[PDB]
Amino acid sequence: QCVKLNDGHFMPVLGFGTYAPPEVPRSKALEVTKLAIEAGFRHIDSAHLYNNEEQVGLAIRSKIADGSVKREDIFYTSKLWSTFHRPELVRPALENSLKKAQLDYVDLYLIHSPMSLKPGEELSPTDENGKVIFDIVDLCTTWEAMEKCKDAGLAKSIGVSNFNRRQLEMILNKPGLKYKPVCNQVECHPYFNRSKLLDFCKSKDIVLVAYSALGSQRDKRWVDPNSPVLLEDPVLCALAKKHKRTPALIALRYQLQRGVVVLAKSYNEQRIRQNVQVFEFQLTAEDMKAIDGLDRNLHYFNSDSFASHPNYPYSDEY
Ligand SMILES: NC(=O)c1ccc[n+]([C@@H]2O[C@H](COP(=O)([O-])OP(=O)(O)OC[C@H]3O[C@@H](n4cnc5c(N)ncnc54)[C@H](OP(=O)(O)O)[C@@H]3O)[C@@H](O)[C@H]2O)c1
Ligand SMILES: Cc1cc(Br)ccc1NC(=O)CN(C)Cc1cc(=O)oc2c(C)c(O)ccc12
């Protein structure tokens, strides 16, 4: 139930999403990450931005101590936040994430976004006029610093997130490149299926990792409340009744059968355990084509605050 990455490491194809909005007590991340491991998740996706690495790491430590899993059974991902793109800041950011999680290494470290931000303590630096303070960083130099983190064993694998094809190409074409990104973690669901980006990643042996694969948490601060609700889609719901599954399980299985590694966030014990049932059934080829037809080029995360960023990834076709 893993895919082999282009550096030889293995990534479980179903991953547990750990992000919850700040209104959710931090203790919940601890509790639900334990439930996810108990349910059978082995890939756990976190990030400096999520303000939960300490709790996610404590969950992993607890399930190692009670004998459920060994460290080597768990695939843990963290992400370099955009205020840390300048190369001298990369390794200290990873070391801080490892200290918080009380891990010796991450299995995967990602550049969280190509949209570099002003360095400093604030995660969302804002100027006097309320505008996001962007930074300008040659992301190939960020990548070179990521490579030294893998050389040092702090990250078993390195990859990117929210890159478009042109941004990936800049890394792949970098002189003296030592390590390809093993993955590109991007928004991917039936309303935004990234088929062209997927085909490019496949042609380069880069894994596409899907986030918001169940339609996002629809946080009113970042997602239009009027956007359609993915799991209410009539085609997904009819396929769910056909297969005696659920719309969420159809959406997750869709990604698995097109070669995409899929994340699924749930803080609900019953839904966490349901999501591992993605391995219990298959969609037909005709089912897959029906889901392919749902694409609406719908990005659930769509704030104008970032559309002006010079590295905004959605100004390109793919
Ligand atoms: N790299 C990035 O920029 C980026 C961006 C966004 C997300 N991500 C990663 O991907 C993860 C997942 O994406 P996401 O947080 O947007 O959420 P998601 O996986 O799309 O899930 C959306 C909602 O679906 C619900 N859900 C889960 N299982 C369900 C089921 N079986 N039936 C019905 N509803 C179900 C969850 O609610 P309940 O909790 O109530 O079950 C959840 O709030 C994040 O947690 C993060 O780890 C990365
Ligand atoms: C991710 C992204 C990609 C592109 Br391209 C353009 C914009 C965005 N972000 C937003 O629009 C909202 N951002 C600022 C916060 C945010 C809210 C949240 O609920 O979850 C997040 C998760 C799970 C992340 O990993 C990163 C950020 C968030």
Curated annotation (Swiss-Prot):
Localization (cell): Cytoplasm
GO term, biological process aspect, one: doxorubicin metabolic process
Annotated active site: Y50
Pathway assigned in UniProt: Steroid metabolism
Positions bearing the site annotation: Lowers pKa of active site Tyr: K79
Catalytic reaction equation(s): a 3alpha-hydroxysteroid + NADP(+) = a 3-oxosteroid + NADPH + H(+); a 3alpha-hydroxysteroid + NAD(+) = a 3-oxosteroid + NADH + H(+); prostaglandin F2alpha + NADP(+) = prostaglandin D2 + NADPH + H(+); prostaglandin F2alpha + NADP(+) = prostaglandin H2 + NADPH + H(+)
Residues given in the record as substrate binding sites: H112
Activity regulation, per record: Strongly inhibited by nonsteroidal anti-inflammatory drugs (NSAID) including flufenamic acid and indomethacin. Also inhibited by the flavinoid, rutin, and by selective serotonin inhibitors (SSRIs). The oxidation reaction is inhibited by low micromolar concentrations of NADPH.
Location, primary (coarse class): cytoplasm
Molecular function in Gene Ontology: 15-hydroxyprostaglandin-D dehydrogenase (NADP+) activity; 5-alpha-androstane-3-beta,17-beta-diol dehydrogenase (NADP+) activity; aldo-keto reductase (NADPH) activity; aldose reductase (NADPH) activity; all-trans-retinol dehydrogenase (NAD+) activity; all-trans-retinol dehydrogenase (NADP+) activity; androstan-3-alpha,17-beta-diol dehydrogenase (NAD+) activity; androsterone dehydrogenase [NAD(P)+] activity
Stored CDD domains: AKR_AKR1C1-35
GO cellular component: cytoplasm; cytosol; extracellular exosome; nucleus
Site, Involved in ligand recognition and product release: residue positions: W222, F301
Tissues where the protein occurs: Expressed in many tissues including adrenal gland, brain, kidney, liver, lung, mammary gland, placenta, small intestine, colon, spleen, prostate and testis. High expression in prostate and mammary gland. In the prostate, higher levels in epithelial cells than in stromal cells. In the brain, expressed in medulla, spinal cord, frontotemporal lobes, thalamus, subthalamic nuclei and amygdala. Weaker expression in the hippocampus, substantia nigra and caudate.
Class of the enzyme per the UniProt entry, highest EC level: oxidoreductase
UniProt entry keywords in alphabetical sequence: Cytoplasm, Lipid metabolism, NAD, NADP, Oxidoreductase
EC numbers for this chain: 1.1.1.-, 1.1.1.210, 1.1.1.53, 1.1.1.62
Residues noted as binding NADP(+) in the record, renumbered to the chain: 18-19, 45, 161-162, 185, 211-217, 265-267, 271-275
Family classification: Belongs to the aldo/keto reductase family.
Protein name: Aldo-keto reductase family 1 member C3
Gene designation: AKR1C3
